[PDB]
Amino acid sequence: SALTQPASVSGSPGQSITISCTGTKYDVGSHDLVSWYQQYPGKVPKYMIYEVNKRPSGVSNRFSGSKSGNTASLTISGLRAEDEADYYCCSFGGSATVVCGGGTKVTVL
Amino acid sequence: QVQLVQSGAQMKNPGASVKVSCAPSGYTFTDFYIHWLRQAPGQGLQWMGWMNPQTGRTNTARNFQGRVTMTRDTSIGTAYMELRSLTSDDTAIYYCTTGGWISLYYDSSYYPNFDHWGQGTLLTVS
Amino acid sequence: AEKEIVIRSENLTNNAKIIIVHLNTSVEIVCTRPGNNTRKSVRIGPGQTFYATGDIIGDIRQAHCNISEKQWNETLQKVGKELQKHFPNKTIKYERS
Ligand SMILES: *[C@@H]1O[C@H](CO)[C@@H](O[C@@H]2O[C@H](CO)[C@@H](O[C@@H]3O[C@H](CO[C@H]4O[C@H](CO)[C@@H](O)[C@H](O)[C@@H]4O)[C@@H](O)[C@H](O[C@H]4O[C@H](CO)[C@@H](O)[C@H](O)[C@@H]4O[C@H]4O[C@H](CO)[C@@H](O)[C@H](O)[C@@H]4O[C@H]4O[C@H](CO)[C@@H](O)[C@H](O)[C@@H]4O)[C@@H]3O)[C@H](O)[C@H]2NC(C)=O)[C@H](O)[C@H]1NC(C)=O
Ligand SMILES: *[C@@H]1O[C@H](CO)[C@@H](O[C@@H]2O[C@H](CO)[C@@H](O[C@@H]3O[C@H](CO)[C@@H](O)[C@H](O)[C@@H]3O)[C@H](O)[C@H]2NC(C)=O)[C@H](O)[C@H]1NC(C)=O
Ligand SMILES: *[C@@H]1O[C@H](CO)[C@@H](O)[C@H](O)[C@H]1NC(C)=O
């Protein structure tokens, strides 16, 4: 579904991880809308970010993010056992279409 | 504040058209876009098409154009989906979501927020 | 004009003539056409093209202009205050075109 992504990045309690979202020219590069979505395993996703680097109500500081030109990346700062989930990147997709990322799981040992 | 509570399980055979729907509640229906999302088992979300509830204009991703038809329902709020030329490869859970904010001064259809969700409908085709 | 608002006309005693007013300070205005139009070219006869509006990509919206109301009310009040001088101590109002 386009938007190649680090399909599985492992970790442990305590450290920070950067999870990326690779766009070609238009989807991420043209304008500045990106968002990340957390599926609890086998369940419906929910919400943590809008406008790349801001948060809604009900989200902590750890679920940060930033733009890097032709690639946007979530920054799960201080990964813990709660992060057993998959963080889906979605963004503007050129024309008037919204594209969705390929997914990336985060596993905590 | 917002709850979409869609239909439960649905059953169809290949080649037909499926009526998937979502029942918004807790907010004025004609003030938010409706974005439809696929989730086939094992892969990530794939976007289907945004729906304007005030005016019936719609759009669809290029991987689904022609096959997907949708209509609004302002009387009840239950927007409808129609997937013609159905295939067993479409054995995927279909989602309903509230998009951005509709206004008279700036196009906000592609704003990929997707604040509130539905609970996933297990549609299997064979 | 560097000094305060100026009012100009041939003969204010005549109602036909058009007044021209110079403001002491500008008021910001913005205009837009949010629809993301598209252009297509159709060729006619020799290498002699003609462009026309294609299909509206995305959603449709009405072109509009935005004027800051704070500055606009202040400026309209000042112009009324100035116009009250040449016409002796009457009320002043503004109506549609
Ligand atoms: C010409 O001038 C005109 C003025 O007459 C201009 O028109 C105005 O333009 C503004 C900006 O272009 C636009 O602003 C938006 O208004 C939205 C609606 O605001 C009203 O409702 C909300 C909700 O009830 C109230 O909070 C607010 O006080 C108003 O009553 C806002 O929703 C917009 O903000 C959202 O988007 C921005 C991104 O730009 C975010 O930063 C911001 O935080 C908001 O995001 C939240 O909400 C959206 C959905 O609404 C979510 O997707 C998002 O995740 C956030 O979620 C939280 O909030 C939602 C509630 O919305 C909640 O359910 C959720 O749980 C979270 O808590 C933005 O502020 C004006 O609306 C617009 N005027 C009109 C009448 O439309 C015009 O642009 C000018 N044109 C030119 C060319 O200059
Ligand atoms: C406003 O309208 C313009 C004009 O359509 C939009 O720009 C166009 O967006 C499409 C959608 O992706 C671009 O097409 C792409 O082309 C590449 C090859 O270059 C191809 O690999 C992709 O699969 C896709 O077909 C198109 O190039 C682009 N054209 C221009 C001149 O930018 C724009 O996205 C619209 N913006 C909004 C906010 O509506
Ligand atoms: C306009 O009509 C033509 C038929 O000649 C059709 O192909 C095209 O999609 C229409 N465009 C719009 C914006 O309705």
**Ligand 1 centre from B102 Cα, in Å?**
9
Which residues on neighbouring strands pair with residue B84, listed in sequence order? none
Contact between B83 and B68 (Cβ < 8 Å): yes
Integer Cα distance of C97 and C86 in angstroms: 22
Q: With respect to residue A69, please indicate whether it lies within any of the assigned structural domains.
A: yes
DSSP string, B3-44: B--B---EEE-TTS-EEEEE--BSS-GGGEEEEEEEE-TTS-
Q: What is residue A22's DSSP assignment?
A: B
CA triplet B65, B67, B69: central angle to 5 degrees? 90
Q: With respect to residue A35, please indicate whether it lies within any of the assigned structural domains.
A: yes
Residue A30 identity = S
Resolution (A): 3.9
Q: With respect to residue A21, please indicate whether it lies within any of the assigned structural domains.
A: yes
Q: With respect to residue A3, please indicate whether it lies within any of the assigned structural domains.
A: no
Cβ contact (<8 Å) for B46 and A1?
A: yes
The residues spanned by each domain of chain B are: 10-125
Number of domains in chain A: 1
CA triplet A78, A83, A88: central angle to 5 degrees? 110
Residue A71 sits in a domain whose CATH number is 2.60.40.10
Residue B122, SS3? coil
Contact between A74 and A37 (Cβ < 8 Å): no
Q: With respect to residue A1, please indicate whether it lies within any of the assigned structural domains.
A: no
Cβ contact (<8 Å) for B45 and A45?
A: yes
Residue A104, SS3? coil
- CATH homologous superfamily of B10-125 equals Immunoglobulins (2.60.40.10)
Phi, psi of B118 (to 5 degrees): -105, 175
Integer Cα distance of B57 and A83 in angstroms: 39
Nearest chain C residue (CA) to B49: C58
Q: With respect to residue A56, please indicate whether it lies within any of the assigned structural domains.
A: yes
What is the domain range of residue A45? 8-108
User: How many CB atoms are closer than 10 A to CB C33?
Assistant: 10
Q: What is residue A94's DSSP assignment?
A: S
The closest CB to that of C62, out of B55, B104, B110, belongs to B104
Q: Determination method here? A: cryo-EM
